[PDB]
Design a protein around this nucleic acid. Structure first.
Lengths: 106, 115
RNA sequence: GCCAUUUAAAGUGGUACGCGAGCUGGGUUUAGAACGUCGUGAGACAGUUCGGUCCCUAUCUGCCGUGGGCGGAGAACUGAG
RNA sequence: GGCGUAAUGAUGGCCAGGCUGUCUCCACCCGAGACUCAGUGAAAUUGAACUCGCUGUGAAGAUGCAGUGUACCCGCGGCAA
RNA sequence: CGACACAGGUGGUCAGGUAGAGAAUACCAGGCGCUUGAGAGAACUCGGGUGAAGGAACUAGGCAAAAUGGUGCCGUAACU
RNA sequence: GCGGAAGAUGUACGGGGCUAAACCAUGCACCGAAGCUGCGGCAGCGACGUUAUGCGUUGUUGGGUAGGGGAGCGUUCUGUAGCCUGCGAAGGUGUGCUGUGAGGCAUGCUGGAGGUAUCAGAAGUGCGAAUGCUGACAUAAGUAACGAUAAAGCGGGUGAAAAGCCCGCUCGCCGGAAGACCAAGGGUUCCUGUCCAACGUUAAUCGGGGCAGGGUGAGUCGACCCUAAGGCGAGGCCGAAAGGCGUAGUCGAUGGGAAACAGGUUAAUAUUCCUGUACUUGGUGUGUGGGUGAUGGAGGGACGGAGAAGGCUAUGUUAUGC
RNA sequence: CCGUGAGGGAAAGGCGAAAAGAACCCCGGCGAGGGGAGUGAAAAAGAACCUGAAACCGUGUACGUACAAGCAGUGGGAGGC
RNA sequence: CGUACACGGUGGAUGCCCUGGCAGUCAAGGCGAUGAAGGACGUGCUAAUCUGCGAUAAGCGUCGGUAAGGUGAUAUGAACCGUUUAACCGGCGAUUUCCGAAUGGGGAACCCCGAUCAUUAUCCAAAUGAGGCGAACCGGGGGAACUGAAACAUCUAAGUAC
């Protein structure tokens, strides 16, 4: 699998991709189940689906496939009218994320 | 008009890069430099050299420690090394009579004699 | 400060005359006006008088209380100060 | 302009009857929240370092000078020096 | 219209729809739910409704609150 | 030496502690300054020799804010000599070497197009410190805030997702009002279909959002026309005029202003469509009939203010009448 | 784009030889999050695309690190990795 | 969480390039009531802009030049034209709706006519002029102040700005 669309923040869309960057795919599923951070889901739908398409297509064994590289950097930005304060008008320079996941045979 | 050049933006570097013993900032920033290094070049502008004639407290304040064990000390310990023999300078000496239970006496028996 | 009725006692001084990022504002140093005094006068007079706003989701530190960990943990206790 | 003056006047001061928390002192409850959880998500604000305590000193009440002692980390809530 | 889907401002007609002292409350017609959510019975206010006894003693001033406060009969001072 | 001497959350010389590890009167040896002396490397001034501020020797040798004087290197372009480069340059990053330094220079990676040295001239030439100007960005905070029309809830439908799209029921809000019809203004924002990346202080298969079409068919509705306060242009009269005071003309308020209602019909329009019927103006004429006319003046439009009788509509109600 | 009006008044350059400017596949609620892969010359190229630094963000590495006192150096002697 | 670096991102500096400006120089130099300048609004099969025209609307005609390629900038799709030699370039001619200084009058582009002043005068506007625009320069008139004189009433800036 990979990563496209969303409305994440990129900044907070990591740290979770962390701890699951090393080897062992199983060590990437046991963890991430309890992150207490919004940055737990979506990033889990992948790396879990990354192992997918790895079994079927691009032949590989789940017993030896590990996480090699995972990075989070992208967007684009977008105007967003997010009424804050007691009553004002401001555009949100919000940015999306980028959760890369490569679970090949290490 | 005149493009800045290899000056400025070439000055932020060639500096900040020399502090192998930097601090929190004073290295990441420049406004923290040229003021942290300004103290450098000075503060001891031309003084490390302090040690000599400074920490040299010992070597002339341990010589008695070396002695005062096989007889007298400092007083008439150096007032005999310049009496007989070629008279060896006091540098490596008065510093060796501590990290070795030898040679230290190779100066005491030298002294106290031909007094 | 005149004073009244009680009170066995019902002292004093410092804390940037402690204390307004705690309060109260009744006072003084605003736009009106009245009055005296000064001036021909507007107007004035640290002379008086009636009406008149005093803000901030404390980050750090300090203190008053409550917990999580660290010296492997559950339960029951002791306890310098 | 001096004096004085019915009715009226959200005008200024004062006293009585009735009443009232306004006060001497103060319990809970109701609606909408605060404390916690899903989603959506700014703007104000900072020289650096920074956990001190007890004395002394200093323009004679500074955490940061002087001498000692001391200081476990993080977090929540408050009243706020 | 006010920079914005800002509880601000903005003319006329419908004032006999039904119950009362009325173009007041409750309710057909018609319209609408487009004024962010979920869990726990703190300290900690603003809004709000009054307290046993006393009762303005608070206070610049009773500010605030409360009280009298429909209708009919009887009766009604100083002053002008 | 002492009496005259009471006050602030724990008291003592820097401490330990010392009859001297106190204090007083002296003295000696050391540690201890970038001090003084000695070995290897300076500056300014003056003297000697000198063309020399080049060297050699000699006396003094070297702290500094404001301020004075002087040296210096980074830099761009155009001379003259003379070189380097895609067996790869300038620039950038890291690193080695050299100079008292300001810097030069080399290596590795990268870049990958040009770039230098000597002597010479040149430039809007070399810069951290104007509540400086402009753009960007960090910590602060993932902290602060969303509140009388305070109403949603229980099932079901559709959908890959539905707490706020739709259906049913139940529970409520508003009533001069969030109802109905309109002026000004805004302006197609209306309707249908297909979607949603952007907008909707959440989501959305929803939208007054994005895209493509469709919709506002009147003689009697409004505009069009005229006029009031008032204004303008032309003639008359004033250094001059795009400057002003009386007459003739004209302009100025969807107010004033000739003429139709009822009903039916569309997914969206209408007293404008359709059906029936009524009415006004202008022209002509078949007939009747047998006079056809600006501008000021007439009624008329200025029917004004205050009090008020009576008549009176549909409707509502008595009637649990039809 | 702002002001009733007179008037005031920005920012945004370049892929390349050609065309590419991201086909196809997996995941997922999804034309809004990409692994992979493809495009390339000197594009250390993909729809505001040449090169592409600093402030800065993420992961990761080297190294300290919840007793710790602070310009955070210097010289001397010991320690390890 | 301190600091350095590595990979990626954010960001956009820098290096290079640049169909642009800035400045100097030569040449050349008025338009219109035969109603111009400017503006409004149309016009290409689709075109929203710009440009060109303007309802024979990015076009028509003649001559000359030129040339096979052409149908403006956008190299799109469709499609057309050209050897009865186009496109393109230069000159010239024809045409050129309505409104528009237009002046008949009113008017925020809409409806009906030579308005006003003046000369000649067959006094019939019949025959004519004026009424506008244009970078600066030029001529004839009116004519400051702040400022300088470190005050100020001459003077000065001014005989300038307007």
């Amino acid at each position: 699998a990979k990563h496209r669309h969303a409305r994440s923040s990129a900044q907070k869309v990591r740290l979770v991709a962390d701890l699951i960057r090393g080897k062992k795919v199983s060590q990437a599923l046991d963890i991430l189940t309890y992150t207490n951070k919004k940055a737990a889901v979506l990033v889990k739908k992948v790396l879990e689906s990354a192992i997918a398409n790895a079994e079927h297509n691009d032949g590989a064994d789940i017993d030896d496939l590990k996480v090699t590289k995972i990075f989070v950097d992208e967007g684009p930005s977008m105007k967003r009218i997010m009424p804050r304060a007691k009553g004002r008008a401001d555009r949100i320079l919000k940015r999306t994320s980028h959760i890369t996941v490569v679970v090949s045979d290490r | 008009r005149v493009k800045r050049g290899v000056i400025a933006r070439a000055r932020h570097k060639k500096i900040l890069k020399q502090a192998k013993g930097y601090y929190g900032a004073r290295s990441r920033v420049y406004r923290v430099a040229f003021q942290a290094v300004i103290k450098a070049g000075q503060y001891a502008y031309r003084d490390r050299r302090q040690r000599k004639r400074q920490f040299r407290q010992l070597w002339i304040a341990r010589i008695n420690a070396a002695a005062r064990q096989n007889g007298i000390s400092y007083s008439k310990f150096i007032n005999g090394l310049k009496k007989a023999s070629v008279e060896i300078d006091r540098k490596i000496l008065a510093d060796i009579a501590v990290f070795d239970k030898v040679a230290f006496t190779a100066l005491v028996e030298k002294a106290k004699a031909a007094l």
